[PDB]
Symmetry: D3
Subunit: 232 residues, 6 copies
Amino acid sequence: DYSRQNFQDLNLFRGLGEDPAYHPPVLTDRPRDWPLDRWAEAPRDLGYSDFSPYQWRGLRMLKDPDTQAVYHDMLWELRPRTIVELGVYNGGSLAWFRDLTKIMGIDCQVIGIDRDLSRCQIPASDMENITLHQGDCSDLTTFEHLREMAHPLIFIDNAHANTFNIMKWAVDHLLEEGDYFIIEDMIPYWYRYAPQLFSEYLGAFRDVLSMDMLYANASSQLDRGVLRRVAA
Amino acid sequence: NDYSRQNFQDLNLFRGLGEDPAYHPPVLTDRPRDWPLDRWAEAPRDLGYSDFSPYQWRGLRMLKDPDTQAVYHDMLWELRPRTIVELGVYNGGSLAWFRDLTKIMGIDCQVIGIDRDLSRCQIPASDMENITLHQGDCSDLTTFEHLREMAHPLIFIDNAHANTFNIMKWAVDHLLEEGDYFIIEDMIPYWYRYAPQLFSEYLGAFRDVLSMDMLYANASSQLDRGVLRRVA
Amino acid sequence: DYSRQNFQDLNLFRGLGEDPAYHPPVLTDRPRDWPLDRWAEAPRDLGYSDFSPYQWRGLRMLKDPDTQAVYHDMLWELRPRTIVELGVYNGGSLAWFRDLTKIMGIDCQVIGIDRDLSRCQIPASDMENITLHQGDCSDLTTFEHLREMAHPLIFIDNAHANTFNIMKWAVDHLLEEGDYFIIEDMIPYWYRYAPQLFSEYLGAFRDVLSMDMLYANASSQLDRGVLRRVA
Amino acid sequence: NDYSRQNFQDLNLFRGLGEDPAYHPPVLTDRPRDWPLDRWAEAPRDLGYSDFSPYQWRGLRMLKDPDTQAVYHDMLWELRPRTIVELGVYNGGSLAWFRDLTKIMGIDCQVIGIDRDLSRCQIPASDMENITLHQGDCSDLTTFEHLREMAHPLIFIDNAHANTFNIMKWAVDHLLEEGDYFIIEDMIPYWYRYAPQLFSEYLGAFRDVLSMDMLYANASSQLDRGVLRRVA
Amino acid sequence: YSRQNFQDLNLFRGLGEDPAYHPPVLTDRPRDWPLDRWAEAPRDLGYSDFSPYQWRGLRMLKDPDTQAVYHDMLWELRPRTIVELGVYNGGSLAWFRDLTKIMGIDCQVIGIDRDLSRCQIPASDMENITLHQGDCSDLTTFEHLREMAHPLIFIDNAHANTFNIMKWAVDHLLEEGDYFIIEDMIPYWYRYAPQLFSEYLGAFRDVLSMDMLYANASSQLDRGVLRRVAA
Amino acid sequence: DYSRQNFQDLNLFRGLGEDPAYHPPVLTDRPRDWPLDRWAEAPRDLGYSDFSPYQWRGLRMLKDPDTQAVYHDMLWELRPRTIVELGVYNGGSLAWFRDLTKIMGIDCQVIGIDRDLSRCQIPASDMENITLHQGDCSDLTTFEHLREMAHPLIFIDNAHANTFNIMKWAVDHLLEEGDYFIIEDMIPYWYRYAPQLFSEYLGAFRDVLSMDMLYANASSQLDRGVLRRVA
Ligand SMILES: C[S@@+](CC[C@H](N)C(=O)[O-])C[C@H]1O[C@@H](n2cnc3c(N)ncnc32)[C@H](O)[C@@H]1O
Ligand SMILES: C[S@@+](CC[C@H](N)C(=O)[O-])C[C@H]1O[C@@H](n2cnc3c(N)ncnc32)[C@H](O)[C@@H]1O
Ligand SMILES: C[S@@+](CC[C@H](N)C(=O)[O-])C[C@H]1O[C@@H](n2cnc3c(N)ncnc32)[C@H](O)[C@@H]1O
Ligand SMILES: C[S@@+](CC[C@H](N)C(=O)[O-])C[C@H]1O[C@@H](n2cnc3c(N)ncnc32)[C@H](O)[C@@H]1O
Ligand SMILES: C[S@@+](CC[C@H](N)C(=O)[O-])C[C@H]1O[C@@H](n2cnc3c(N)ncnc32)[C@H](O)[C@@H]1O
Ligand SMILES: C[S@@+](CC[C@H](N)C(=O)[O-])C[C@H]1O[C@@H](n2cnc3c(N)ncnc32)[C@H](O)[C@@H]1O
């Protein structure tokens, strides 16, 4: 029935899905064990929904395998001492960045920054190398607090509110040479909707930032949003 | 160096809309408008401008694309609605359209337009016969409690997408009679990716009161599986 | 039925279909009302032939919505007083130009020309500002007989017969600075079969005609065929 | 003013035929015919000329593309035809091809050409063995009587497409035998797209006497769904 | 199954299990589809489109698009001698001979291979074709033939030791205007060894050239048509 | 020039490439730093050969990120105490498996096998729990010399010789309920090249092995190769 129900806002779920806990996909319309003597007879598509079906030790990943492939290459090149996500959801990306700099012999500090850090599904006792922080984007004191951080640094942006003042402040009071400011997912959508202003705003950074063309065309998500600092 | 001699804005605002609600025509960059016929074959065969939201009607911007337009023609012609409503307004270009078409078709419709910010609206006052703007939110349902029993048949369109199931719930129990439509543009395919289970339920609780109208349902990218009506 | 039925030269319908009168599409492999408790299991395709579904007030359209949006832009910018369609079929294009100019507030006179106006479907009543004309294109008296038209103006060829002579006449006798001559559909085809002869022809007009590259690439049907007097 | 005194031949004449029935091989424009191997990779990968009707056979043009040819090759092998009829000659390239193949295959097969206009036929007289041309129109069925009952089996091929069903009618009642082919190259899809109802109803008529040969019928773009043959 | 031996399915790579031509068979539908249900009939081919091709009851691994190219090439440059290196069932062999026969070309076909046993050409049908057993690794398999008339086309369908074989040809065989072609494999050699293939290939700039008329005209011959240049 | 040089049989590089050591991509047609005042005018294509540009801590990877996602999910479910790569080339996938089971907290011992181990690239400082063997697949001795190892067990065929015969001995002598046996890459090629046999051979194992549909369709490389043991 409809007349006895109250509905949520499914907008809260965009680019995220329902639940930050991992769901292990199950098959509906086929047996896991397909009989081999009917090999050709078996269906070729997935079996389940390919929305965001990507995990890391039972923790959901918002970055697809290609975006992972990029971040791996980038990490192995820069040996980044600090990696700062800005937008956390379930924390999987944080548990990845840690687990990865670890086997790379990079002693790295991974920092999450979300105003709501309650969706984090990481075990209490898996949090070696990590520092969370609560703070809204429209206030720049949030980011000052972490200025005595080792370099090289990679600032990823995954909320993307007040991003441009965060960039202006970054350049003016944080990024050393060849540190990465990365805007994930949205940059093309800003050029879709607002071409005149975007091309002005980005174009203002002409002399301090620049797109890194090794990584910038190498994944759907990072497409055209990977930046770093120059000498000037 | 233009970075610090500028204050930057929020550009998330323009998502789906574009920076200016007033119509500006396309202009050409890499070609002339007047291609010489001696070199007809040399002519570039691509468009020449942002294919984002080029469309228009009588000098006002239009967000419904030509296919969508088409569908609402066939729809209006078949149904002959005495009322159409547009939750969500922006430049009010689609209101002018709905009004002009019904007029040409001999239909005595009244177009309504419910926004919170009508300031963007662009129609000349002098050209507003059979159009009414109401202000208010999609959160609380009083915005709609003053919508009189206007004439039927009646088409409801959601374009804001906020609390758009509680507004569905109100429309079914208070307003829609047989044959009346209720159309969620744009958003139904994204809600289905981001919540396959929850959406399939919320939507299914209208089993006995609403059916998707296949004739128009799969005939536009914007109206894609977002066209519903009553059969009580 | 093979030893009885006699047949209709089915080439007649090449391009237009069987019935010039509109008939809404009906479903076949479907209910119209798909149940919402099965929303995710409903077909995604259209469910009816997408040949020419398009219409304008019970009249057939053979200008897909995209082409429709082009001429609209064109009509808005130019504000023409005359729009000569050439080839009528059902006259859906006729009524839709007169309707559209009407809302735009423009004093416009639509004129269809065709060797056969017997499939025109326009209601008797809805004929304000539409002047029909009978005559073959391979007769240039079809064109002389025309009284003087007002400007600015657009000339649309959908008959694609003896078209280059008709370009010669129109330039010589009718078209003014800024006026369009628009060949729908056919340009790429001629350029596919006779590329050498097509250029020869098109290129003669280099001093009197240009491709308006603002509209020229904005619709399959108008693909590289929107011309107008640069003068 | 090159237009003032240019004799404008009617361009509709060349529909799917071209300017000239005489074969002339294609010609490079933007690229040297011999490419230097030092710059191998920077050599362009697009054809070079117009893919409109590039094909040929012994200096005669071929309107039947290689996909269509393969089909005819397999059908000639299987059927070992004793007679083959073309309705619509043009340059008669297909006429030569059909005969040259039947000779190689070791098949006594008279080839026959029918056309109201045989002035474009390019087959030299010295190479006319086993090929009989025929002046005549489609409308007039008298034309087909003097097919002096040729030997079977037998492939009828409609390339003219005029009064076609009224030829089919004749052929069935007068010329075809258990296994003989009646084939309509190209049009069948276009008639279905233009006259959906009347075409099914017309094609339905020949149900008892004819079948589509599903082996060949989906086998080339040009022969597509128009390879028919005598059942029972 | 536990006392079974399984063959190397890589022996059948790009060839298939049987060198004989058998004709395709429809499983899921009738050969004779009924005309009342014409619109419901499958649009898809109806069987495996991997090497479905044949010439007079022999399998053809050259597909139609490639045959059209070789025809143009034969017709233009009447060759006195064609050389396949790679034979399989010999359909390319008896094809190359048959075309030359209808063209009035006095042309000798020769096929060379370490394995001929898979050849399906009957003895009655060997006129002007000649088989040879020899290995690529060994260059002395080839000098047997520098008493062969020109013009000459020389196809590589084997892919072993190719670059050494090319250089033997350029030095000891090809006269100006003659063809050496590599079917299928150049584009994979470029994929796999960008730097080494470009080298091995650009060594022959002073003696060979990519024929641009014949090169981009099939899948199989992609960028492998080469010929001898003016000295 | 050519007549001096010796040419490696370029087919040795089929599916692998020239250098087994990793090298990072190098841009040719663009700077690495594109200026922001002309962001919109930058190229959208990659900038290098997408042939096999993937890596893992300085070692090349021939499994693509898709395939690496499937192998993750698999490991995390099975927690294999033994993985067996059959074919090794640069040893990169050998390491990746060892690295990943390690951080998952699994005590898994990775095993590679090859006829040729000289290409392998893994530093000995970083060799923990990786065991190599030399041996042809040809010879069933290669495997009988393999010592007992712990389950659960994934057995990957990445080299594709004698692949079915190996499967037979794997089922008889090595595999156990729940253990895998995955033929990466080749199975879809064997279906096109040899359908009749490929089915008779695969289906001969119907009683013992099954296609794990959860992973067997989630990667173009693993596509329809993922088998697993089941009583
Ligand atoms: C939208 S999610 C990340 C999704 C990711 N961009 C994707 O689609 O792949 C970003 C997180 O940042 C938080 N967030 C949004 N705006 C913020 C702000 N202004 N300051 C701090 N956190 C914010 C949200 O609560 C949310 O959990
Ligand atoms: C997609 S635009 C409207 C499109 C409009 N029908 C047209 O085509 O011209 C979305 C509109 O919804 C309005 N809107 C967004 N959130 C709203 C809310 N919570 N309550 C009422 N209106 C809202 C915005 O002001 C905006 O004008
Ligand atoms: C394609 S239909 C018209 C299309 C329609 N007006 C539109 O806007 O899309 C072409 C029309 O031109 C007519 N026609 C064909 N040949 C003609 C000729 N030689 N002279 C005059 N009219 C001709 C036909 O009778 C037919 O009605
Ligand atoms: C497409 S061409 C022939 C194609 C050629 N047979 C082939 O191999 O594909 C069409 C031919 O039909 C002929 N034709 C057109 N109308 C005809 C008619 N009414 N009666 C007989 N032949 C006609 C034309 O002269 C023209 O040569
Ligand atoms: C692709 S098939 C030949 C294709 C066929 N001739 C055609 O025209 O399409 C490959 C052939 O090359 C032969 N071959 C492979 N390696 C060879 C070598 N090293 N020496 C001689 N022949 C070889 C094989 O015996 C096999 O017959
Ligand atoms: C696709 S690569 C293996 C990639 C491997 N997964 C990795 O990255 O670690 C193929 C390998 O199979 C090996 N190989 C080929 N034939 C073989 C055979 N008959 N016996 C053993 N190894 C063989 C080759 O030497 C080559 O190293």
